[PDB]
Design a protein around this ligand. Sequence first.
Ligand SMILES: C[N+](C)(C)[C@@H](Cc1cnc[nH]1)C(=O)O
Ligand SMILES: [Cl-]
Ligand SMILES: [Cl-]
Ligand SMILES: [Cl-]
Ligand code: NA
Length: 425
Amino acid sequence: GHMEITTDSLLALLGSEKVKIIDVRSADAYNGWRMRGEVRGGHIKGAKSLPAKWLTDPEWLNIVRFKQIRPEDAIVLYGYTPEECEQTATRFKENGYNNVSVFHRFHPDWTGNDAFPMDRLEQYNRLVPAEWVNGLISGEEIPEYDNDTFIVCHAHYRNRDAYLSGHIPGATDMDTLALESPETWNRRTPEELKKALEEHGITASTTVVLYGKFMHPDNADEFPGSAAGHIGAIRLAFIMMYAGVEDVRVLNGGYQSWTDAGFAISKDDVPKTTVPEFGAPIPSRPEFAVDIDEAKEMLQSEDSDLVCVRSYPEYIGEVSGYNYIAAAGRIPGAIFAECGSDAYHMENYRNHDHTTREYHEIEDIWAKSGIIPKKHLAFYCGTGWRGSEAWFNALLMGWPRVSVYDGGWFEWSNDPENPYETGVP
Ligand SMILES: C[N+](C)(C)[C@@H](Cc1cnc[nH]1)C(=O)O
Ligand SMILES: [Cl-]
Ligand SMILES: [Cl-]
Ligand SMILES: [Cl-]
Ligand code: NA
């Protein structure tokens, strides 16, 4: 019943402003993961991501409208299989979208023929799906993995209960306080990171798969970070990558993506299998970390900028954003990139299933504010968690000079002589 567009008609529609090509597959296949063993992973050039699993969520229509997909547009759906687009095509028709067509020949006609344009996340192999993690712990052959030593880490902030309430089988928990000091809220000393990483069984040659569990943080609680598990996992990914771990993966979406895939969980308290040595100088990637002295230089140079990954009430100085940060204000000269509702949510960088937002939508918003890969960018926030997530998103894009200003507003405001702004800009 649904209309069909031929491959030649779709090739002619490429570049039109009225046409919207929508990838129905998962975000990981959209990012570049070859989920069905295709010769070439990714999406049709110019396509948007709207996974079919979002149909069971009542915000589907709001997600579509938020992506500015209007009924005036010619909708072209595709996936690994045209029958996988039948449910989405019907839902579009039931909501006032009359021009809905299904592209039947994406796999293997578009994937196998390199003459057809395809785009992908340049560093997608660091944003692993749940199926990849399951194959890793099962000893099965998986793509984008050529190592022999791995470890799955469940990140949390003074909350082992986040690990004991349910985790990936065989995984071990790492409190974020093991890699960052509560005094400076920055990354720890190399000697401290060396001891901490070794005691958790992590070497530089180890493939560390990091993930966290979202447990709905509340700003009024004592330690809301204990529920922002996935932000801490990306925060720990930044520190480990800065330390010298070469193969660091992050589970796209966190713990929920594991359970949403139908994989069982474990509640065991897995003991740590320590390693005698880390095996590399810490830090082996010093470029990833930027401190306050270098941050002030980047504010003065047109070659560099700092990206304020904070919430709007924090940016205008209405609130500090934390129950342990006294001063309220913003660093002058930094480019504002709103993170989300408060300091413990990343709505502007995530989907409703906590997977990373469509990376094309992120770089377009960043481009409108001057945040471009041409510059050396040091993302920051209150202490570094939200800045690390935005930094990881840019690193997945392949940006050559992205860093994290570790000190953030906390270190900046701890000095009374540092300038600061307030109110609406
Ligand atoms: C540095 N701690 C762990 C105390 C932060 C972490 C954090 C979460 N969202 C932004 N930052 C906090 O919990 O407020
Ligand atoms: Cl297009
Ligand atoms: Cl989270
Ligand atoms: Cl700021
Ligand atoms: Na920090």
